Structures are given as C-alpha cells and as structure tokens.
Design a protein around this ligand. Structure first.
Ligand code: RP5
Ligand code: RP5
Lengths: 217, 217
C-alpha cells in the first residue's frame, strides 16, 4: 500500500510567490518519495499547483482530486478537458490527475480522510497556506485525531511565518489547558517540504501520551 | 421570535479564572437582553458555566444544550439528575436548561446552526475560550457564512488576548489574499460580553461587500 498525503491549501495563489513555490516544492518532494497526492480537486491556486507538479512527475495515477458536484463544469475549456460519462467536465486528468466527483462537502472531507487513513506508512495531512477552508479542514482532522478516529499526523507547512498565529494560539491553549497535555503534539510544523514529509513519516500518535504517562505507568 | 446565541467554548475551565468569569459575565449579559442560549450541552467547563448562569437567571426554557448520544449518561448522579423517556440521563434541566440528544456530531452542529439561523435579530455565534473543538466549530460556521449558508455574525470573545494568535493569522491571510476582501469582517472580536453581544447585534453580512463594491457599483 502506497503512502498518501492530503494537502489542504488555498484556492488562491497568495501574494508572496513563496506560497506557490512551496506548492511546487512539496509537489516535487512528494513525487520523489513515491507519495500519492490527495487534494480537494480543481486547477486553481496552491491546490492546482501541487496537483500539477505531482502529476507532472508521477502521472495521473499519483494524484486524486475530490470535487463536490457544485464545482463541476459541464463544458470543455482550458484546464478542464476530460469529460465523465455523466457529462460532467473535470480537470484534465493528464495534468491534474484523476478526479472523483461527490455529492456533498461532508462526504468529500470524509472521503479524502478515508483515503489518507487507509494509506500506507507516512500517510497524513499537510496544511499549506490557505484561508478559512483549509483552516477548518486542518482543525477538523485535528478534532478527528483527538477523537481517536485516526492515527495519522498533521503538519503545517509554514511559508514565511504564515501559520505563526496559529502555532501561537496552540501554545496559548496548551498553556491555559484547553488543549489537554499530549494533544499539543497532534500538530507539528515545518519550514520546508522535506521537513513536512519527514514530520508525517516520523509521527506517532501515542508518542506524547507515552512521554506523559510512562514514568506514570 | 427571540434572539438565540450559540456559544462555542471549552469543556475545561482554563488556567486563568478570567475565562470562567467571562463565561459567567456572558451568561448574565445574554440573560438580561432576553437572549436564549444555544450550546453543546454538558455541565463541565465554560459551556457548563454559561449554561448554569443563563439558566439561573431566565429559567430552563432559555437554555438549549445539544448533546451527542456518546456523551449521554444512563445513571443519575450530581449535575445529571433529569432522565429522558428513553432512560438517557441528561444535565439537570432546572440548572442547565433543556437538553436534546442527537445521534451524531454532524447533525448536532447542524442543529445548533439551525437553531441560531432561525433565531431572531441579534442571533449569531460567539467563540469563547476553548481548544481544538471550539476552534473547529468557529471556522466551520465561518466557512458556512462564506458559502452563503447563513447571514449571522461570528464574534470571538477575547479573554486576556487568548484569541490573539487567531486574529493575527486572519490579518496575515487577508494580507496574503487567502481570505478574500470582504471576508475579513466575517469574524469580529470583543474584550467583554457586552461587546460581543453588541457585535452580534450590529453585524450585517453585506456590510463589507457594500463597502468594497458600492463606489464600484
Ligand atoms: O483558501 P480556502 O478558502 O481556505 O480553501 C479553498 C478550498 O479549500 C477546500 O477545502 C474548499 O472546499 C475550497 O475548495
Ligand atoms: O475545548 P474543546 O475541546 O475545543 O471543545 C469542547 C467541546 O466543544 C464541543 O464542540 C465538543 O463536541 C466538545 O464537547
């Protein structure tokens, strides 16, 4: 079973080019380690960038985008050149990998989650630069890890201190005890693609609990 | 139709007592303005505190907690003294208001959301101090406002700069353009209960879009 990484990132490119560049780099690194890509479909923004790179290196089979019905096209144009049997028009499979269309956002998130959880070793979630959506997804899979629904790691790829505020809040929450001891390590951060992939590889859920309650066992 | 406020906050009390005190104050303020409370049920932490206060001032009818089946008790003890017809044991209704038990977390969030959306004027969501759950909920209803699923405001109640990191990240995201112009005002913040309630009252979704595209219309 190959390793799969779900990369939550923005639908927009971002002001500083370092975000797009980070998308490209993460793409290359994931592609070299034979890591298959799970992302929320589309051809725009950091998502489309990572998809484009990973697919460009390891072919369509290495990328699986999952798009809600509402974001589906019904005409062929530009980056959307591959048609489904139900006449749905979807991102060009040879450039952005395979694309599965689902009815709802809920089943979408659930499906990406599933595809990551069932993935091989080193599987996990990476949070690249994005807005409210990517954040919501990140904290969602965080909550799911917290509920013992999965055992995969979650790593924020910090481009020029973009996630600094969030790490800061995590610190504040662990300090005030709202994030219980042992849960602070659910999320890690990295400054580069290799760091993020390594983070997902070396992650073990029971690590923090081991540290906190082994001298206590 | 009365005004309903959903207050997302931690299941733990927090280190600094200012959090608990803030729960109490928000409770009092909401109760005085005849604002009915929607919260995720339970008797523990800031949630239980706000519930306890609001209910103590305006009776059980003013508080509606919504609890997943998994957090339900089946024996009577302490703060859980009221039994349902299906023998489920639930928070004492006279102290923590009414409690509706639902099967799943999804339908739970959906239901709280529904109860807020259908509420009167001044209805909205308040994010008091909490961990990964409250954050996930906040960014969730943010995403929903962003998707035009509701028109209610979202306000973070900032106790001693607890939400500072998050506001900071929002600033960074709006700066890098990941939070599109006009969406930065989806979430506001306040230093006190009155400020939060006033924020929810005076909120209008179309405010920012009005500002950005009226000289452009
Ligand atoms: O930049 P944001 O809005 O945070 O994320 C954009 C994408 O992130 C996905 O989850 C959404 O369903 C949307 O397609
Ligand atoms: O302190 P956190 O974990 O963020 O929030 C605790 C509560 O927040 C609710 O949404 C949960 O379902 C949980 O009952």
């Amino acid at each position: 079973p190959r390793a799969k990484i779900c990369v939550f990132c923005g639908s927009s490119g971002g002001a500083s080019p370092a975000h797009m560049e980070a998308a490209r780099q993460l793409g290359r690194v994931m592609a070299e380690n034979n890591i298959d890509l799970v992302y929320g479909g589309g051809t725009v923004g950091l998502m489309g960038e990572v998809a484009r790179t990973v697919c460009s290196i390891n072919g369509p089979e290495s990328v699986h985008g999952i798009i809600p019905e509402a974001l589906v096209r019904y005409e062929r144009d530009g980056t959307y050149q591959t048609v489904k049997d139900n006449k749905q028009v979807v991102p060009t499979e040879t450039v952005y990998g395979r694309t599965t269309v689902v009815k709802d956002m809920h089943t979408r998130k659930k499906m990406m989650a599933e595809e990551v959880i069932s993935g091989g070793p080193g599987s996990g979630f990476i949070g690249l630069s994005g807005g409210y959506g990517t954040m919501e997804e990140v904290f969602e899979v965080i909550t799911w890890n917290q509920l013992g629904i999965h055992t995969k790691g979650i790593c924020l790829l910090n481009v020029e201190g973009y996630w600094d505020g969030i790490l800061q809040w995590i610190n504040m929450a662990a300090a005030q005890g709202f994030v219980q001891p042992g849960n602070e390590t659910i999320v890690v951060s990295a400054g580069d693609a290799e760091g993020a992939v390594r983070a997902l590889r070396e992650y073990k859920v029971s690590e923090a609990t081991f540290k906190l309650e082994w001298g206590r066992q």
